[PDB]
Amino acid sequence: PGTNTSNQVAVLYQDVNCTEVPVAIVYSTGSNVFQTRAGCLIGAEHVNNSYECDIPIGAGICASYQTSQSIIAYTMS
Amino acid sequence: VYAWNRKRISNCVADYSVLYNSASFSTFKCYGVSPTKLNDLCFTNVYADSFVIRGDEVRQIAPGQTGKIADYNYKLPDDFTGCVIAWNSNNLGNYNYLYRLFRKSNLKPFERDISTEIYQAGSTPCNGVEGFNCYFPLQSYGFQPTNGVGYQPYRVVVLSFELPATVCGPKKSTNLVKNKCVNFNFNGLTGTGVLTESNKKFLPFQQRDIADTTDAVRDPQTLEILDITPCSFGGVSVIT
Amino acid sequence: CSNLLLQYGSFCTQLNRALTGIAVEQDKNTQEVFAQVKQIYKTPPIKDFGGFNFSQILPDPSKPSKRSPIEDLLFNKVTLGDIAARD
Amino acid sequence: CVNLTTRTQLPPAYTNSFTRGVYYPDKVFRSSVLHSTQDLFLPFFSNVTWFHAIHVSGTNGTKRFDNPVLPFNDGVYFASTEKSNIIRGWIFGTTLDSKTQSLLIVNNATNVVIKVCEFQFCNDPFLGVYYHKNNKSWMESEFRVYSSANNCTFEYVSQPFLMDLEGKQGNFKNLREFVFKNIDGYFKIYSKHTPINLVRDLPQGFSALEPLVDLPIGINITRFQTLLALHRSYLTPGDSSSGWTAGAAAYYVGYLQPRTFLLKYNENGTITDAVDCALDPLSETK
Amino acid sequence: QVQLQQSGPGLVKPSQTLSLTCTVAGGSISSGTYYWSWIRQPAGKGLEWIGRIYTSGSANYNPSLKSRVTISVDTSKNQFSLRLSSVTAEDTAVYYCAREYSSSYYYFYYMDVWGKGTTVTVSS
Amino acid sequence: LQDVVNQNAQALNTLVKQLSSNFGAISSVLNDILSRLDPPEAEVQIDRLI
Amino acid sequence: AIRMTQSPSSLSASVGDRVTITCQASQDISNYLNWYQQKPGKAPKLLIYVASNLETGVPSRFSGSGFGTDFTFTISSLQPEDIATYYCQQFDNLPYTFGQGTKLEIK
Ligand SMILES: *[C@@H]1O[C@H](CO)[C@@H](O)[C@H](O)[C@H]1NC(C)=O
Ligand SMILES: *[C@@H]1O[C@H](CO)[C@@H](O)[C@H](O)[C@H]1NC(C)=O
Ligand SMILES: *[C@@H]1O[C@H](CO)[C@@H](O)[C@H](O)[C@H]1NC(C)=O
Ligand SMILES: *[C@@H]1O[C@H](CO)[C@@H](O)[C@H](O)[C@H]1NC(C)=O
Ligand SMILES: *[C@@H]1O[C@H](CO)[C@@H](O)[C@H](O)[C@H]1NC(C)=O
Ligand SMILES: *[C@@H]1O[C@H](CO)[C@@H](O)[C@H](O)[C@H]1NC(C)=O
Ligand SMILES: *[C@@H]1O[C@H](CO)[C@@H](O)[C@H](O)[C@H]1NC(C)=O
Ligand SMILES: *[C@@H]1O[C@H](CO)[C@@H](O)[C@H](O)[C@H]1NC(C)=O
């Protein structure tokens, strides 16, 4: 997100199986690992509600920054 | 060869012309600069290594050149800028020019190994004891005066340098002109343009743009700061 | 270097011609999009306008520069030894 | 010198290095740019040793800590802080037994002298001389426990760069960041004298280094050290005055692990902000 | 044989400014080797250092009195002076001036010569 | 509107920065090449740069 | 400030005995300890600027020893002229603070 808002970054591995990212992998820890058709997303928790797209990712997964303060990814509304 | 000397020369102004006018030199070679254009350039930490080989020298001494003596004693860097010279010194029968015999591992360029330990050529390893089939190193090579070419000694000297210089040549300094389009050769850097006055802080020495074009120069004498601006040029439109 | 470029045909002429054509065509775009009427009309003193107001977009009759606060704000919001661009 | 093998105890402490150790890469002037380059550096946040060997008249019951072995490791950091100008020189080399040329530094006194002699060990021939107010020039006495060598080459003399600034009973004023680098062209040295009000806490302010000297040498260095053990003798055993008593030294150190940095020169020409690249994904993005 | 001799008023009314001066003899105070200090001792009490001044002009004082005390030097006449404002009943004491000498290779600091002192009483 | 200016400026900056590129030659400044190497074998370097 | 505490504040001794007075600083002062003499009706006089050496005109009977925070001043043989008050003083902190004094009397 904007450096003004925060400094928390999340990584996305393109089309790498989340079931195989242990081979791929402070962010290498398993905290909230999500799997998308676009790859493996590490560093953001998953949310179930619906919001407008802010930062596109792939396969309709849109990510945003909402507050404690962390990054979320969700189905685009 | 394995015990060459490194003499660093600085703050010198010598005629770099007789260095090739010496007819005693068998053959003069330069690999990084034009031999005639030796006076113009500015040098930094000139080196004066010296070693001798029995005849078959040029076949082995060259950038990226193999050779048993060359690959076991001293190689030159792949990016090298120097001028090696060679000339016979047989007149100066004399088994005193002792050479290294063999080295187990290749030698990195610009490292000198004085240690002479009899390597374990044979199967038997020993510590401090001459082992079986342990070829003794540092063998004195044949230098009979009547021996033919390829077996005669020489007086080879390699001159390597790096291109903050303070190593001037035989060019006489001149006067300074301000606010005029001139061909300026300030120390190493030369170019054309107009020299103006600019006032900033310049604690770091010498010179600088997005394109790395020079914008200020530290005068070698009367240390101050000048500014370089290109000569006024522009396109011409012919309306008719 | 000037002599050695002479052995490469007319690359420089081609590039210069292309860039000159570019430079011509932008100003052609401007003349086409803006200048569509050849009668510069004079702004009448705004009095009635059926009750509607226009003081924000008409050029200011006060400052000599024929601009408007909307126009001036628009010009000031854009961030472009004479300076030609941001860098 | 060396040590009296008084290796009583060795407490290893680790400290988090904050933004520190940014130096000028090359002597070229720039201003108001964002030039980025890769070179020898130390990471922005790397744990480093805190060698608590500052035994100013002991830590507790003359609890003195030694510093015999310290490997070079392709580049070195250094820092220390103390009112007394006890800091005296650095030693470099692999064997330090007249087998490899060793870098010896003598500071203060008349002028700073740097030597690369091939001596056997620390000679200490005159390291205790005309000190305090003995005010008599006997010159007959010499340092007892060890002898002296003679082989030397490349003597260098200059104005003492180990500047004590203003040695006074202030809050906290002295922090030296003598950074030593080894390359084939020349052994490179940097320094920066900064006043900071914290003694245990390494300052988090963003200072920069400046070049000091260009001494050309291509000798191999594998270990470093510092000998503040001059005037460690009590002079007369009854006198019991080794300066005050024995010595003390911080020699807070660390290793480089080179990387690529992005430095932002300010309007005037100094370094205002530097950022790492591989520190974090945000750093890579920056 | 450097000696320091004091000239003072001896008596100062309450809430007035006490002015003292110490004349240095046997050598010039403009030598950079010395620190010149004022010290005081109340009748029957111990010694309390008041402040020093380096010959260059830099001054330093006991923090408990820094606001009210001012020490100055006059090397052109080889004296230094004290000005202590807001005199109180505790300001009655003998005031000594003294030279301090120190080295840089060894930052030891000691009072190697002292003045004779001057009695200051604060009364109406 | 800002995008057009930004893109043009960035392209021009890249074009200018391209000058500091040795392209495998000895130096990235042609004047250095001229002052260092005589014409008989400097033409190769010049041709690479061109 | 740094507080200095001496074991005796007053003492009476006879001619010829060895007398020892201790001084203790609130925290480690290295060896930054000076010794002063206060004669009856006289100005303060420096006796031991550093424990190792004696100041000019200081009788040889005065010596000092000790380490860290605790230091000792000894008079190997007291004489009637030694009746006086002895003060230790640190200069580790910014103020040149002095001790409370030890009155040495002669029997
Ligand atoms: C990813 O892992 C799953 C594990 O259930 C596997 O079924 C799938 O084929 C994998 N996808 C790949 C390797 O593209
Ligand atoms: C989001 O939905 C998934 C789907 O079952 C569920 O496992 C998860 O707990 C939900 N998270 C919430 C409700 O925060
Ligand atoms: C070189 O020029 C400088 C210019 O200031 C001068 O000071 C110096 O004496 C000159 N060196 C000589 C004449 O050897
Ligand atoms: C039109 O706008 C101007 C600008 O403030 C104002 O002075 C004027 O009264 C307005 N006229 C209306 C609202 O009729
Ligand atoms: C430094 O060491 C501490 C040990 O407590 C550790 O928690 C910290 O992560 C280390 N810093 C790093 C790895 O950057
Ligand atoms: C210096 O080194 C040489 C070895 O080349 C040795 O012969 C000589 O004795 C040395 N000088 C001394 C030990 O004073
Ligand atoms: C220099 O010393 C280092 C110590 O680790 C060693 O790795 C290296 O090979 C040495 N270089 C030489 C002997 O040229
Ligand atoms: C640059 O120098 C000027 C000198 O007046 C100063 O005002 C300015 O703050 C300096 N810039 C810095 C310190 O970044």
mmCIF file of C-alpha atoms in Angstrom, chain D residues 128-223:
data_model
loop_
_atom_site.group_PDB
_atom_site.id
_atom_site.type_symbol
_atom_site.label_atom_id
_atom_site.label_comp_id
_atom_site.label_asym_id
_atom_site.label_seq_id
_atom_site.Cartn_x
_atom_site.Cartn_y
_atom_site.Cartn_z
ATOM 1 C CA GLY D 128 55.979 4.582 27.779
ATOM 2 C CA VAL D 129 57.829 7.892 27.614
ATOM 3 C CA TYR D 130 57.774 11.252 29.417
ATOM 4 C CA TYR D 131 54.222 10.669 30.605
ATOM 5 C CA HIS D 132 52.244 12.386 33.391
ATOM 6 C CA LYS D 133 54.743 14.807 35.019
ATOM 7 C CA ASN D 134 57.892 12.742 35.466
ATOM 8 C CA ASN D 135 59.525 15.805 33.812
ATOM 9 C CA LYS D 136 62.956 14.159 33.622
ATOM 10 C CA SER D 137 64.542 12.779 30.454
ATOM 11 C CA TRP D 138 66.349 9.670 31.673
ATOM 12 C CA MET D 139 65.725 7.682 28.453
ATOM 13 C CA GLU D 140 67.640 4.830 30.104
ATOM 14 C CA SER D 141 64.588 2.737 30.992
ATOM 15 C CA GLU D 142 62.727 0.512 28.531
ATOM 16 C CA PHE D 143 59.591 -1.620 28.496
ATOM 17 C CA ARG D 144 60.397 -4.823 30.339
ATOM 18 C CA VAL D 145 58.393 -7.914 29.469
ATOM 19 C CA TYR D 146 59.208 -8.054 25.742
ATOM 20 C CA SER D 147 62.052 -7.151 23.389
ATOM 21 C CA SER D 148 62.120 -5.206 20.104
ATOM 22 C CA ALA D 149 62.765 -6.000 16.445
ATOM 23 C CA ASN D 150 64.491 -3.978 13.714
ATOM 24 C CA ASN D 151 63.148 -4.873 10.236
ATOM 25 C CA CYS D 152 60.945 -2.104 8.842
ATOM 26 C CA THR D 153 59.710 -0.605 5.588
ATOM 27 C CA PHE D 154 57.368 2.143 4.382
ATOM 28 C CA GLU D 155 57.358 4.557 7.286
ATOM 29 C CA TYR D 156 54.568 7.120 7.024
ATOM 30 C CA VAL D 157 54.132 10.222 9.193
ATOM 31 C CA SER D 158 51.276 12.728 9.248
ATOM 32 C CA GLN D 159 49.175 14.876 11.543
ATOM 33 C CA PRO D 160 47.455 12.655 14.154
ATOM 34 C CA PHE D 161 44.042 11.700 12.792
ATOM 35 C CA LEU D 162 43.116 9.963 16.054
ATOM 36 C CA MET D 163 41.823 13.308 17.315
ATOM 37 C CA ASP D 164 40.502 13.455 20.872
ATOM 38 C CA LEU D 165 38.592 16.654 19.960
ATOM 39 C CA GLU D 166 37.929 18.323 23.348
ATOM 40 C CA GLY D 167 38.786 15.935 26.163
ATOM 41 C CA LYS D 168 36.697 17.261 29.020
ATOM 42 C CA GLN D 169 34.271 16.219 31.739
ATOM 43 C CA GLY D 170 31.270 16.506 29.449
ATOM 44 C CA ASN D 171 28.177 14.345 29.269
ATOM 45 C CA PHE D 172 29.286 12.247 26.257
ATOM 46 C CA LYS D 173 31.262 13.709 23.343
ATOM 47 C CA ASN D 174 33.583 11.199 21.611
ATOM 48 C CA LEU D 175 32.607 8.533 19.077
ATOM 49 C CA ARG D 176 35.169 7.400 16.498
ATOM 50 C CA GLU D 177 34.111 5.274 13.532
ATOM 51 C CA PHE D 178 37.435 4.238 12.105
ATOM 52 C CA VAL D 179 36.456 2.052 9.174
ATOM 53 C CA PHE D 180 39.192 -0.018 7.549
ATOM 54 C CA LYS D 181 38.905 -1.559 4.084
ATOM 55 C CA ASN D 182 41.409 -3.690 2.172
ATOM 56 C CA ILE D 183 41.631 -3.649 -1.618
ATOM 57 C CA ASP D 184 44.545 -4.322 -3.947
ATOM 58 C CA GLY D 185 44.865 -0.667 -4.916
ATOM 59 C CA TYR D 186 45.239 0.676 -1.384
ATOM 60 C CA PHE D 187 44.216 0.133 2.226
ATOM 61 C CA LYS D 188 41.334 2.565 2.648
ATOM 62 C CA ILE D 189 40.439 4.366 5.878
ATOM 63 C CA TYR D 190 37.399 6.361 6.946
ATOM 64 C CA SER D 191 36.589 8.302 10.096
ATOM 65 C CA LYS D 192 33.816 10.383 11.629
ATOM 66 C CA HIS D 193 33.979 12.033 15.059
ATOM 67 C CA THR D 194 30.476 12.446 16.465
ATOM 68 C CA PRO D 195 29.110 13.610 19.827
ATOM 69 C CA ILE D 196 26.275 11.386 21.090
ATOM 70 C CA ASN D 197 24.645 11.483 24.524
ATOM 71 C CA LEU D 198 24.170 7.696 24.836
ATOM 72 C CA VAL D 199 27.054 5.431 25.844
ATOM 73 C CA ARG D 200 25.486 1.958 25.885
ATOM 74 C CA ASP D 201 23.120 2.610 22.970
ATOM 75 C CA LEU D 202 24.723 2.938 19.553
ATOM 76 C CA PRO D 203 23.359 6.165 18.007
ATOM 77 C CA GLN D 204 20.511 5.858 15.517
ATOM 78 C CA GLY D 205 21.281 9.148 13.777
ATOM 79 C CA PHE D 206 22.361 8.997 10.155
ATOM 80 C CA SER D 207 25.966 10.111 9.841
ATOM 81 C CA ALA D 208 28.376 9.553 6.957
ATOM 82 C CA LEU D 209 32.072 8.776 6.648
ATOM 83 C CA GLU D 210 34.820 10.679 4.832
ATOM 84 C CA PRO D 211 38.060 9.362 3.318
ATOM 85 C CA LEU D 212 41.253 9.900 5.287
ATOM 86 C CA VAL D 213 44.334 8.509 3.512
ATOM 87 C CA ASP D 214 45.351 6.566 0.380
ATOM 88 C CA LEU D 215 48.202 4.237 1.322
ATOM 89 C CA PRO D 216 49.034 1.720 -1.435
ATOM 90 C CA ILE D 217 49.680 -1.815 -0.211
ATOM 91 C CA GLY D 218 48.726 -5.282 -1.395
ATOM 92 C CA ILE D 219 49.607 -7.423 1.619
ATOM 93 C CA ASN D 220 47.233 -10.054 2.977
ATOM 94 C CA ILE D 221 45.345 -9.358 6.213
ATOM 95 C CA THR D 222 43.467 -12.130 8.013
ATOM 96 C CA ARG D 223 43.300 -10.911 11.629
#
